[PDB]
Design a protein around this nucleic acid. Structure first.
Lengths: 136, 136
DNA sequence: GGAAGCCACATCCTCT
DNA sequence: CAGAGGATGTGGCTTC
DNA sequence: GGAAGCCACATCCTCT
DNA sequence: CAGAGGATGTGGCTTC
């Protein structure tokens, strides 16, 4: 397998094509280092990540079906191997007061984007959900 | 402008489409952090970067038409704002002994990939030069 | 998890 | 500077 | 370039 | 744990 085949094979697994690349987003917003909410928003728009993180179908609500995986990847993106959902959730918890992301009380591993995503990605959650083939 | 527009606009400038993405290459080779030679290989395959870095038309030979720009970007990709051609060249000098890249004596800012790129990107420099519309 | 190494540079400097 | 390399130091990663 | 700040987490801990 | 937050500490970046 050459580089060509390595890229080709990942494409056939629907990887490397998130609609909202974190890196790009950070660039657009001028946030500098990639931020958590941004990273999640990248995953949530990359069809290949739908197995461990996805939109519930209700507005900007999403679920961390596989916390441990979401955590690993965020841990990798920030170069922090000890990263787990137990510290990552702390990150998200900070957002509550900064009204960026809120916790949906009662549902394990479910939060919701509360800020104005439509203006940032020019898409109503209904459209986005259709583009990713969001089930519910 | 929204993130959507920001993405399509850069797309119309032929950006964000390098044939040999550094990040991917690093993954394929399992090198871990992106390496200099790999970065340069990304730029050289991204049609939008042809103004400050490009193949001379002779095999794997290339030129840093705009050293200062090349240096800035590499400085950005590694998070090292003080990054210049004066230091970056050092990095390249280190490949001379590791037969990965050599200096073409006589031409200011011109070096040549000496390792086996054909096997890594399954392309003869002739083909690659055609895909980028390399002039000389 | 965890400490100990290994490697690519990032930095600085000296010559020519 | 541009272009060789030696002397250092450290961060991100592989390795016990 | 350069020193001083700011901000987003990464880490740890305590309850319920 | 999962999930709220307080108390800390530091790296990447913005700001004088």
């Amino acid at each position: 397998g050459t580089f060509k085949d390595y890229v080709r094979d990942r494409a056939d697994l629907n990887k490397d094509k998130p609609v909202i690349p974190a890196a790009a987003l950070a660039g657009y917003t001028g946030s500098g280092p990639i931020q958590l909410w941004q990273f999640l928003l990248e995953l949530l728009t990359d069809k290949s990540c739908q197995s461990f993180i996805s939109w519930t179908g209700d507005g900007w609500e999403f679920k961390l079906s596989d916390p441990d995986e979401v955590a690993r990847r965020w841990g990798k993106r920030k170069n922090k191997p000890k990263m787990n959902y137990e510290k990552l959730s702390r990150g998200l918890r900070y957002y509550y007061d900064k009204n960026i992301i809120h916790k949906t009380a009662g549902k394990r591993y479910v939060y919701r984007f509360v800020c104005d995503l439509q203006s940032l990605l020019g898409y109503t959650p209904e459209e986005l959900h259709a583009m990713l083939d969001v089930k519910p």
